[PDB]
Ligand binder design. Structure first.
Ligand SMILES: Nc1ncnc2c1ncn2[C@@H]1O[C@H](COP(=O)(O)OP(=O)(O)O)[C@@H](O)[C@H]1O
Ligand SMILES: Nc1ncnc2c1ncn2[C@@H]1O[C@H](COP(=O)(O)OP(=O)(O)O)[C@@H](O)[C@H]1O
Ligand SMILES: Nc1ncnc2c1ncn2[C@@H]1O[C@H](COP(=O)(O)OP(=O)(O)O)[C@@H](O)[C@H]1O
Ligand SMILES: [Zn+2]
Lengths: 434, 443, 45, 439
């Protein structure tokens, strides 16, 4: 019914990276078709990621436009799943106006390593029923409720002070951590939502807690190595986690954190989870930034890098020099290259079928045939874009299944590049600038 | 256990006592003249005689210049600072290029300085202000001292203190059953909290309890603390421990690096010499390893001419893989190694060389037995051959993926049929470029 | 001067239960340690 | 044995220019040899700097690479002594992110003129015998007290003022301490505990090294000489309580009005006899790094009566002036090159190249045979002087490894085979042309 904040897009139907237990790729599964050789390679590097034994590995995905390079990376990210970091950026995002291209890459690396820690807790969480105090040091008692139980505490002096500072009253829902002592309001009980009729600028209604009043347990927290660096940058640095406002972390801090994390894994207090960094459109990193990757991929703790690129032999940014993929040779031999292949008619049918299943559309077999030709005379991505429009024409026509005529109407309204650029030549002197 | 990286096997230079190289030792193989040369450089750094002298490791991609630079740090060991950098680090948004270089030159020089710490700590059992038998003339009462009784897991004793302590013991909200400490070089007292013994005396209290101190009431130790000159630069250029508007404002504001003045560098040099003269502190001149030098700008190189001639500077190691390139920050000026001729006049070059087919085989075996992999000889004689047709790095790169494929197919070692399958999955730089050239109308 | 603590820490009121007192019951006034012991106290009183 | 922060570096052997009283250069003295013509000229400009009469004089030192341009600049910087400001900059160092180029040069100028202030104050210096502090039972806070001070010859009692008592109590001085009090400033300072009384003590409030009691008269005068550049006077006056910017370097683009105001006040102090102005030198090495905007500033910046003497060095032929199309001598525009005197330097012979090596081995603590010097001198003409100098330590180390005690010719032939000259390196780079990057 109600439209959530996430909805149907490009790399949406891929729900993994379709492989048997022997890492043989199936012809069609987990929303992917064809690309068998690259999908085996993707499987092997995925196994390498999951082991996490060896650092600083890198892979490059290469091949012509509309052949599944970002599809394979967006598939692999889901096969890997959450619980393991995976950070994706476009190449063009490192050109910050407040830190160097080195720092933008450094943070993108440190953001793809996770630390896991155990923590031992007890907390109290309930609706407050009555606070009572008397003057003989002060003495008092306080009563807590939860749907399962009602109970009393014989609180000491500093708690009596703290409850007055935080101005608790009956019907407030509160938490305390006993080890630390600090009080924290969560809101007021729905059962009390009427003892006033003009409420303050912010008060918030919550349900009364349930279960045991003083729950005691282990919890496990996973925290990215980057955040440990940021919290140690300045006296209230954590604010910069949200603000983005953090300015070239001093090198001796990152060194100190590495020493401490290494100590905790030897003690067994923590463990390190290696993740991935994906840079799409990597061909527009700059020559200074490439020369930094030459030593980033050599630390005792670095992610695996996956990079994707669409370029032939072409000029490296920041220089005159031609090279393969627009990448320097001193990096291309630290990499390991996976190449896609263009699709057949057979694959082009199957991938259109998966898109109509994802976008919830029915088409005639004739219509799939005609669309397949259009998606082979012109780019795959154009044929994928016709199907939504074909459906919208069909609804206006009061149909239900898309026919050949719905394809031909949309094909008349919306041009591809090749038809467009031809019409631009027939009137060229009316356009601006060449 | 610790993860594995592209240099994890390099453990030293591997030389005889006579300083000649061994064919294979401490993880390295081959390059004997270059390893012998680095042998001399290690002695130069350990001599502590010299400043500013510098070396450039020059040679093609994947010939071992980074490995050799790392090996020097193993020969020196942890006690002397070795500072790594890449040429691309100079281009900061906070601070000028020449300051980045000057900071790194001051990171590669260390002090080791040693001092006693003494402290008193324990749970406070009594505060006993002690009166004299008679007051001084005209006064009602006079206190000669306070007694404080401290206890720890080892025992209990009274400390006798000056009456002026009593003011501090009510600024801090000290009460009996707290645990406190006193800094024996300063006389100041600080509360830590109520002892853990009393954690049960209410169902809730808004204080974290702290465990009873273990060991004696009075504690002493000598510690050796080690810092770079760059740490003294920064700690003087932006102070801490504020109780003033300038400090606190400066600490709520976003911190940023600043162009430290040559006066402060001057004053720090003046005072550390006083301590070195008094035998309080030991200097350890170290190494700065500027890798990928060919990324520096001509403004940077022309600053290094001054920096390397300073009587203070560390030993600098440079590296490069470029042929006759144009110098960055000029239009047309080609030069060897991508460096200006008038800097290249101030460095001793060490030359590094391509490996033979036998040497690559020997290195690939050293990778496999450190990456934790077993390989059959008929497979290694394939992988060393691939290396000879392609590159050392690519032929080493295939080891882990081959192992994974072997393990998925249920075997405990790499075999011939594994490596010739992985070779079908992953291309190299040479073969990929061929595919591009045959298809150049579609990229 | 430091007055000494009492000997044993307070324990649960439910007779077979070794755990320390966490809180006291709002109705019956017994010292308690968990929801399990609160239900048992409320059923047996 | 002990290693200080300053060590043996590239120019550590130079200790002056070695001129005689008639200002003629000796063949070899104060660690400089040969180069008679330029050393004479350096003598004359050094004499002009010491006289101090005339502002904005400029000198350019020119010649081939590796012929003692920087060496002569260091030579005069030694001869000129420590008491007179001498500032070094490489031309690259003015391209700041914090301030504009004309600001950076203005700071480098104003950092090179000293104001020298002698200061005397009266101090009391003694061992504390006792302290009394009296505090009101409620009152306004008008604390009062008495203190007694001793020396080996004299002791006396002081009735204490209300502004002063806060200082003693802030710094927590107590009996047995030895202290120095500056009467005019109202500041206390402490030398340490006297050896005697710390035996009669409580549980420890301090644990530090002792010091001896002062002698003779309890009150004495102290004298300090401060040298303060015009630049630090500008910074101090740029804002209230700005002192940290003298170390931090955070002060950007200082207001012109402040400098104008300081230039006036400095002149008044001169006429009053309160301070001495002392012109110094600015040395810009590698000066061909400057943009034409920087050169254009120097044209007119050099014409103020507060300008220091300026020295520049360069190794450049006719080349295009940085940031423009135009070729010119030394890569400097003629506007500026017309405003200065050029001193030029000459390539070396066998006779002086050998003598440079001889004076270098004396500084690095090395012995070699005359045969070894003969070979090394040939290397130092087949290839540059700096390379020959660089072999001397490498030869000493290879000698010491094999338990020798004097460098022999086969040690030098060994080292020469191990570490390359540029020319040989560049030659081997031809035969692997495809294997290096971006040829
Ligand atoms: N093998 C595939 N299976 C499923 N969808 C694919 C496949 N290859 C490409 N696509 C789809 O085709 C479109 C283009 O693929 P994409 O990977 O983004 O192109 P490129 O390779 O140029 O980066 C996307 O909508 C993508 O989901
Ligand atoms: N002499 C050697 N002995 C052992 N391993 C080596 C040697 N030279 C290079 N390697 C290894 O081969 C790879 C390439 O060396 P590297 O130092 O990165 O080369 P370069 O800096 O010349 O590009 C690394 O994995 C390195 O550890
Ligand atoms: N005339 C000389 N007397 C003494 N030492 C000299 C002389 N000329 C040059 N040197 C030394 O030779 C080296 C090269 O001189 P340098 O000042 O670096 O040359 P330049 O600045 O002209 O390029 C330095 O070590 C320097 O101390
Ligand atoms: Zn119980």
């Amino acid at each position: 019914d109600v439209t959530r904040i996430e909805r149907i897009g490009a790399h949406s139907h891929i729900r993994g990276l379709g492989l048997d237990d022997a890492l043989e790729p199936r012809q069609a599964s987990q929303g992917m078709v064809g690309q068998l050789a690259a999908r085996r390679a993707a499987g092997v590097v995925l196994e390498m990621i999951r082991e996490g034994k060896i650092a600083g590995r890198a892979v490059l995905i290469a091949g012509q436009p509309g052949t599944g390079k970002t599809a394979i990376a967006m598939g692999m990210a889901q096969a890997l799943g959450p619980d393991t970091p995976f950070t994706a950026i476009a190449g063009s995002e490192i050109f910050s106006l407040e830190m160097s291209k080195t720092e933008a890459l450094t943070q993108a690396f440190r953001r793809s390593i996770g630390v896991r820690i155990k923590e031992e807790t007890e907390i109290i969480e309930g609706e407050v029923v009555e606070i009572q105090i008397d003057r003989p040091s002060k003495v008092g008692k306080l009563t807590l409720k939860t749907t399962e139980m009602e109970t009393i505490y014989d609180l000491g002096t500093k708690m009596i002070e703290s409850l007055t500072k935080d101005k608790v009253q009956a019907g407030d829902v509160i938490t305390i951590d006993k080890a630390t002592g600090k009080i924290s309001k969560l809101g007021r009980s729905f059962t009390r939502a009427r003892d006033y009729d003009a409420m303050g600028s912010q008060t918030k209604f919550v349900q009364c807690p349930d279960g045991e009043l003083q729950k005691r347990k282990e919890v496990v927290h996973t925290v990215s190595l980057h955040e440990i660096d940021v919290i140690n940058s300045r006296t209230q640095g954590f604010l910069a986690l949200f603000s983005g406002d953090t300015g070239e972390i001093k090198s001796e801090v990152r060194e100190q954190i590495n020493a401490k994390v290494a100590e905790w894994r030897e003690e067994g207090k923590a463990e390190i989870i290696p993740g991935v960094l994906f840079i799409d459109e990597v061909h527009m990193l700059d020559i200074e930034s490439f020369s930094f990757l030459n030593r980033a991929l050599e630390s005792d703790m670095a992610p695996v890098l996956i990079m994707a690129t669409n370029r032939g032999i072409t000029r490296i940014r920041g220089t005159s020099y031609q090279s393969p993929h627009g990448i320097p040779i001193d990096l291309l031999d630290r990499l390991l290259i996976v190449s896609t292949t263009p699709y057949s008619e057979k694959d082009t049918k199957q991938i259109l079928r998966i898109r109509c299943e994802e976008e919830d559309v029915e088409m005639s077999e004739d219509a799939y045939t005609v669309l397949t030709r259009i998606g082979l005379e012109t780019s795959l991505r154009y044929a994928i874009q016709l199907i939504t429009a074909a459906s919208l024409v069909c609804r206006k026509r009061k149909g239900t299944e898309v026919q050949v005529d719905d394809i031909k109407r949309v094909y008349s309204l919306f041009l591809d590049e090749s038809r467009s650029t031809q019409y631009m030549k027939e009137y060229q002197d009316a356009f601006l600038f060449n | 256990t610790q993860r594995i990286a592209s240099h994890s096997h390099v453990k030293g230079l591997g030389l005889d006592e006579s300083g000649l190289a061994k064919q294979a030792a401490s993880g390295l193989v081959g390059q004997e003249n270059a390893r012998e040369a680095c042998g001399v450089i290690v002695e130069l750094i350990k001599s502590k005689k010299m400043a500013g002298r510098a070396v450039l490791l020059a040679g093609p991609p994947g010939t071992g210049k980074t490995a050799l630079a790392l090996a020097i740090a193993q020969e020196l060991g942890s006690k002397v600072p070795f500072c790594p950098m890449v040429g691309s680090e100079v281009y900061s948004t906070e601070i000028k290029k020449t300051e980045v270089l000057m900071e790194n030159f001051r990171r590669a020089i260390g002090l080791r300085i040693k001092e006693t710490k003494e402290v008193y700590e324990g749970e406070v059992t009594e505060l006993t202000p002690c009166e004299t038998e008679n007051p001084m003339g005209g006064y009602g009462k006079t206190i000669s001292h306070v007694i404080i009784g401290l206890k720890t897991a080892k025992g209990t004793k009274q400390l006798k203190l000056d009456p002026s302590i009593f003011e501090s013991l009510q600024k801090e909200r000290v009460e009996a059953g707290d645990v406190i400490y006193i800094e024996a070089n300063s006389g100041a007292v600080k509360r830590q909290g109520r002892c853990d013994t009393y954690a049960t005396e209410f169902d809730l209290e808004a204080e974290e309890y702290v465990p009873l101190p273990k060991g004696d009431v009075h504690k002493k130790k000598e510690i050796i603390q080690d810092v770079t000159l760059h740490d003294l630069d920064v700690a003087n250029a932006r102070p801490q421990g504020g109780q003033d508007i300038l400090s606190m404002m400066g600490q709520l504001m976003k911190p940023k690096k600043t162009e430290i003045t040559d006066k402060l560098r001057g004053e720090i040099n003046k005072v550390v010499n006083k301590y070195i003269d008094q035998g309080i502190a030991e200097l350890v001149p170290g190494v700065l390893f500027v890798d990928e030098v060919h990324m520096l700008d001509i403004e940077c190189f022309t600053y290094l001419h001054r920096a390397l001639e300073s009587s203070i500077a560390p030993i600098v190691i440079f590296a490069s893989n470029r042929g006759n390139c144009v110098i960055r920050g000029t239009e047309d000026i080609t030069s060897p190694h991508g460096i200006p001729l008038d800097l290249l006049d101030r460095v001793m070059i060490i030359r590094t060389m391509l490996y033979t087919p036998q040497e690559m085989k020997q290195i690939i075996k050293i990778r496999a037995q450190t990456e934790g992999i077993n390989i059959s000889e008929e497979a290694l004689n394939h992988l060393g051959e691939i290396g000879t047709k392609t590159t050392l790095r690519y032929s080493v790169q295939l080891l882990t993926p081959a192992n994974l494929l072997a393990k998925i197919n249920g075997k405990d070692s790499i075999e011939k049929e594994h490596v010739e399958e992985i070779s079908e999955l992953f291309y190299d730089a040479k073969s990929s470029a061929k595919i591009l050239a045959d298809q150049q109308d579609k990229y | 001067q430091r007055p000494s603590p009492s000997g044993p820490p307070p324990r649960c009121s439910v007779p077979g239960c070794p755990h320390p007192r966490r809180y006291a019951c709002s109705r019956t006034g017994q010292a308690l340690c968990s929801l399990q012991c609160y239900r048992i106290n409320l059923q047996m009183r």
